[PDB]
Amino acid sequence: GSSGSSGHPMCKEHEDEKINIYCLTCEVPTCSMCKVFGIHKACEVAPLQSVFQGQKTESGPSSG
Numbered sequence: 001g002s003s004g005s006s007g008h009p010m011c012k013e014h015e016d017e018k019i020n021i022y023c024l025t026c027e028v029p030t031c032s033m034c035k036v037f038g039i040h041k042a043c044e045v046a047p048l049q050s051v052f053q054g055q056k057t058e059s060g061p062s063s064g
C-alpha cells in the first residue's frame with residue numbers, strides 16, 4: 001500500500017560492490033573506485049560515515 005521493505009543502493013557499475021562513499025553532484029550513493037577510477041571525477045564525494053556540510057574533496061583533479 002504505502003510502506004514496504006527496502007535495501008541499500010548498490011553501485012550501478014559494480015553490481016556486487018558494497019557502497020563505500022556517497023556522491024553529491026549527481027546525488028547517488030556510488031563506490032569510491034568509480035570516483036577515483038571512474039567517471040565520477042568532476043563530482044563531489046563525501047565521507048558516507050557522517051557526510052556533514054562542506055565538501056571534503058581535494059585529492060584528484062576534475063575533468064571536463
Ligand SMILES: [Zn+2]
Nearest residue numbers: 023026040043
Ligand atoms: Zn557522481
Ligand SMILES: [Zn+2]
Nearest residue numbers: 011013031034
Ligand atoms: Zn562503482
